[PDB]
Design a protein around this nucleic acid. Structure first.
Ligand SMILES: Nc1ncnc2c1ncn2[C@H]1C[C@H](O)[C@@H](COP(=O)(O)OP(=O)(O)OP(=O)(O)O)O1
Ligand SMILES: [Ca+2]
Ligand SMILES: [Mg+2]
Length: 430
DNA sequence: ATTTTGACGCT
DNA sequence: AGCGTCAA
């Protein structure tokens, strides 16, 4: 009752760019705008692997992970843009730079946590308080929320999409108490007004559209964001949680899409997030551990305390290349040449990072996979990163992996290498 | 033969 | 530290 926390103490948003790499390529090449199109890396093997797909192309069934040759079978007029290739490998620089454009705009509104190349969480609690003080008891107009959905509404006693959206928004705004500056629902609504402004700024200043979720924590904001993609935002209130979770597959909640989620389903014999409420906290801890159990117990009630971390920049800078099938590296010269290629890209990115962000990486992580090994990585070894020099970094990586070559003949490498990975970590201010 | 990334947890 | 999980 009066002491049961309800996890309504924050306003958190999650902004996720729509079909991001596709929009970057469509901004650059207007011929691709409003077309079924996809972004592909490489081309020789089955037309290249698709990594991003416009919504027009998704209507034909085109998906990520599909080979372009296969996507063309579903969508013969599919347009394709290829990822840049530099030093023999795919180079994602254009998308990292576009990401910086968006992150820098979002940071004008609030502290952000960069969650991925095209997603950031926003802690809007303070901005909401300020905006509520400015508003001075003034009601919030539907015109301030032109792309907002209120999850769960309309309800109770038009057949078009926008009509339903407006009916739900009208019900929501009709039922708010605007004089109570401590109302969580009012706080979320002001949050959504701010997110409309943030999304408009992103689109105005970059050309890119995005979706967003607004709720009281990161997990619900993320879930909310996906409910009405693309180019829309969704408010998930605390009160919407029981109905929303009553038919929500467990795997849809962030962190439960893999083995742990499968084990929750198997061990407990349930399917939906809401079914978790019938277990005690101790029961969940007994099956899934102290941390996961407490997290599950609160999360299924819509409560999560994970903070929006103040971090706009990635914590690592990495370069990776697979060598599948017959391309596996089988000679010392091959391994050294590709380590150099990776190291040269890493050097270029690190030097730019040091100039832009006043920091230096101090550790180099080298990871490889050997042909035959079932694990993704066969070996992961660190060494010191003391100079931004590609030849030195490639030599040091070779030094830390050379003992993996079983072959008695020095010129041959066995078992052949199917993956090389260099990652700069442990940044210090400079 | 999706590939190329990142973050964080465990021991 | 090195390995594993989960997510763009
Ligand atoms: N598995 C992957 N491998 C390589 N790149 C990926 C992968 N998944 C996503 N990306 C890249 C391309 C995407 O445009 C970008 C953002 O990913 P993601 O948010 O999951 O999808 P998306 O932005 O393309 O579409 P949308 O968010 O509208 O559903 O990251
Ligand atoms: Ca996205
Ligand atoms: Mg994303």
């Amino acid at each position: 009752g009066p002491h049961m926390a309800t996890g309504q103490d924050r306003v958190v948003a999650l902004v996720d760019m729509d079909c991001f790499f596709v929009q970057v390529e469509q901004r650059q090449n207007p011929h691709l705008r409003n077309k079924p199109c996809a972004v592909v890396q490489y081309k020789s093997w089955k037309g290249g692997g698709i990594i991003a797909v416009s919504y027009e192309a998704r209507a034909f069934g085109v998906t990520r992970s599909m080979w372009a040759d296969d996507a063309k079978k579903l969508c013969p007029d599919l347009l394709l843009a290829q990822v840049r290739e530099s030093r023999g490998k795919a180079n994602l620089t254009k998308y990292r730079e576009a990401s910086v454009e968006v992150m820098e705009i979002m940071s004008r509104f609030a502290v952000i946590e960069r969650a991925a190349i095209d997603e950031a969480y926003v802690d809007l609690t303070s901005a909401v308080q300020e905006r509520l003080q400015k508003l001075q008891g003034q009601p919030i107009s539907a015109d301030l929320l032109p792309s907002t959905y209120i999850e769960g509404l309309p309800q109770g006693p038009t057949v078009q999409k926008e009509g339903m959206r407006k009916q739900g928004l009208f019900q929501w705004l009709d039922s708010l108490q605007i004089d109570n500056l401590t109302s969580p629902d009012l706080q979320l609504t002001v949050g959504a007004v701010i997110v409309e402004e943030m999304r408009a700024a992103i689109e105005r200043e970059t050309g890119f559209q995005c979706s967003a979720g607004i709720s009281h924590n990161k997990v619900l904001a993320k879930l909310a964001c996906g409910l009405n993609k693309p180019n829309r935002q969704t408010l998930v209130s605390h009160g919407s949680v029981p109905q929303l979770f009553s038919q929500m597959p467990i795997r849809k909640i962030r962190s439960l899409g893999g083995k742990l989620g499968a084990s929750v389903i198997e061990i407990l014999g349930i399917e939906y997030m809401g079914e978790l409420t019938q277990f005690t906290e101790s029961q969940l801890q007994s099956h899934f551990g102290e941390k996961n159990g407490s997290w599950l117990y609160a999360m299924c009630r819509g409560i999560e305390h994970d903070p929006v971390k103040p971090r706009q920049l990635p914590k690592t800078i990495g370069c990776s290349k697979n060598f599948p099938g017959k391309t596996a590296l089988a000679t010392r010269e091959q391994v050294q040449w590709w380590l150099l290629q990776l190291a040269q890209e890493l050097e270029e990115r690190l030097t730019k990072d040091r100039n832009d962000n006043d920091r230096v990486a101090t550790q180099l992580v080298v990871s490889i996979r050997v042909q035959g090994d079932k694990r993704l990585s066969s070996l992961r070894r660190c060494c010191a990163l003391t100079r931004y020099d590609a030849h030195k970094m490639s030599h040091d990586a070779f030094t830390v992996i050379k003992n993996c070559n079983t072959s008695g003949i020095q010129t041959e490498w066995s078992p052949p290498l199917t993956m090389l990975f260099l990652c700069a970590t442990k940044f210090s201010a400079s």
